Structure 1
């Protein structure tokens, strides 16, 4: 009796909302395909496992922060490279004014199709992001350092002049404006951030990021990247031993971590990861310092094992196949 009157009042209101605002303005969550989480590869297999859903989520904001020369630009370019191989359009907003195009090419970026901008102000940087996001034609946008997003009042002013919370206010306003445009267009926005010190603070970690508190709330993923050591060919330092900690995650469980190598002029060592995951999943046998695949001695030392997997593409296809099928916790489709 009342069931029916409530169902009619509901149907009428849903009708009036859809009339006033448009077709998909309100609906049942179970029948809204828009709100399914789609992902892209990061270029690292250990990071795709740590993210739980197999990569970074489309239509969302991501933050990548860390100390000096930890691999923040290298990691974001490998994301772009992987997205371009899947026929997506990418854009780089270079507020730091420090991108080497030859090095981007060596990491596998198609630089003749990468949109690049070196904007004068933080307001111009963020207005280009909103213009590209509304277009529906760009899939991935990277903004290199939040720290270099200078407000126009600060650019026009003198050195020593105080601009209290002006950049924090610009970042608050930009998040409000962008979150909805990105979700509609299904665009991924990645912010890189630098670290600074808080002083006068309680016993919590004194490390902070720039541009205030808004971005911490609006980000669906936050990644802390750190150089934890060196990779040596005898004496020559040839690369960096890297750790990525997942510090926030809204698409899967957080506080997982990834270890991988960045090799100078190649990027992320994909086969180096595929060894370590083949070991952990009992598909490669490491007897002391002798790696073995089904009895066959693939090599001695991780570098020789990696070199073996390079010249056997069939064995690398097979191990990738299994590791993918086993270890991904939240596969989408």
Structure 2
């Protein structure tokens, strides 16, 4: 009697809404397959575990920030490389004007299929993101530094001229327009960002990022990448020891961190991670500085152990399959 009139008035309003605005304009959340979270590999296996869902979410915005020469571009090109290996189309908006296409090829990016723009203004760069997002043909877009997205008024102006909150305003407007378009297209958007200092502050952290407050809110994931040491062959510095902290996560629990090696010319050391993950999950035994798999001594030191797993791709397939089985927190299906 009471419950019956409500069910009818609901059905009528759902009819009236779907009439006015189109068919999927309102529905029950259990029946919406568009609203399910789908991920893409980062290249790093330690980072796929730290993110909890097994990688970066499609249809969302992601921010990567950090200090100078910390691996922000290199990480972002390993995401594209792994995406192109699954027949996805990718775009690089290079606002910093500093992409070396030979390095991209050495990291395993298919140069010949990667779309690239070196745009004149910030407004031009963000209009090309909206055009590619609406198309539904591109799967991953990267925007290298938002620090470098100069508004048109600032490019036509003189050095010294004040433009109060202009880049902030442009980013606020861009997120409003993009968020919805990226979700309909199932397109991933990765913003790279530089660090700056905030002055006349209390005792917070003095580090900021460029481009205002909008992108913090709209980002589904935020990563903070840092160089924490050197990788040496005696004298020759051959790479960087790198730490990534998940500073915001809406698809799984945050404040997990990943540690891996970037080697100059190859990129992220995949077999290096697989050792450390093998040790942690008691599939590899560490006796001081001696690594042992099923009794058989694979090597002495991490480099020799890594070199062994290179030579035995059956053993490396076996351990990868096992670690994936165990340690992934939220496997989708």
Q: Per the shorter chain, which TM-score range?
A: over 0.9
1:30 corresponding residue in structure 2: 30
Q: What do residues 161-211 of structure 1 show as CA deviations (whole Å, max 9, x unaligned)?
A: 000000000000000000000000000000000000000011000000000
Q: What do residues 257-283 of structure 1 show as CA deviations (whole Å, max 9, x unaligned)?
A: 000000000000000000000000000
SS of 1:163's equivalent in the other structure is: coil
SS of 1:34's equivalent in the other structure is: coil
Extract unaligned runs of 5+ from structure 1.
none
Q: What do residues 105-141 of structure 1 show as CA deviations (whole Å, max 9, x unaligned)?
A: 0000000000000000000000000000000000000
SS of 2:320's equivalent in the other structure is: helix
TM-score using structure 1 length: 1.00
Report the Cα offset of residue 145 of structure 1: 0.1
Distance, in Å, in 2 between the alignment partners of 1:43 and 1:16 is 47
Distance, in Å, in 2 between the alignment partners of 1:136 and 1:201 is 44
Report the Cα offset of residue 2 of structure 1: 1.3
SS of 1:147's equivalent in the other structure is: coil
Distance, in Å, in 2 between the alignment partners of 1:99 and 1:83 is 19
Report the Cα offset of residue 101 of structure 1: 0.1
Distance, in Å, in 1 between the alignment partners of 2:227 and 2:3 is 62
Q: What do residues 217-259 of structure 1 show as CA deviations (whole Å, max 9, x unaligned)?
A: 0000000000000000110000000000000000000000000
Distance, in Å, in 2 between the alignment partners of 1:177 and 1:332 is 29
Report the Cα offset of residue 57 of structure 1: 0.1
Distance, in Å, in 1 between the alignment partners of 2:57 and 2:306 is 30
1:242 corresponding residue in structure 2: 242
SS of 1:120's equivalent in the other structure is: coil
TM-score using structure 2 length: 1.00
Q: What do residues 263-307 of structure 1 show as CA deviations (whole Å, max 9, x unaligned)?
A: 000000000000000000000000000000000000000000000
Distance, in Å, in 2 between the alignment partners of 1:200 and 1:165 is 19
Q: Structure 1 stretches (4+) deviating beyond 3 angstroms?
A: none
Report the Cα offset of residue 68 of structure 1: 0.2
Distance, in Å, in 2 between the alignment partners of 1:222 and 1:202 is 24
Distance, in Å, in 2 between the alignment partners of 1:36 and 1:329 is 17
1:171-182 matches, cutoff 5 A:
171-182=171-182
Report the Cα offset of residue 17 of structure 1: 0.4
Report the RMSD for the aligned CA atoms in angstroms: 0.3
2:49 corresponding residue in structure 1: 49
Aligned length: 333
Distance, in Å, in 2 between the alignment partners of 1:152 and 1:121 is 6
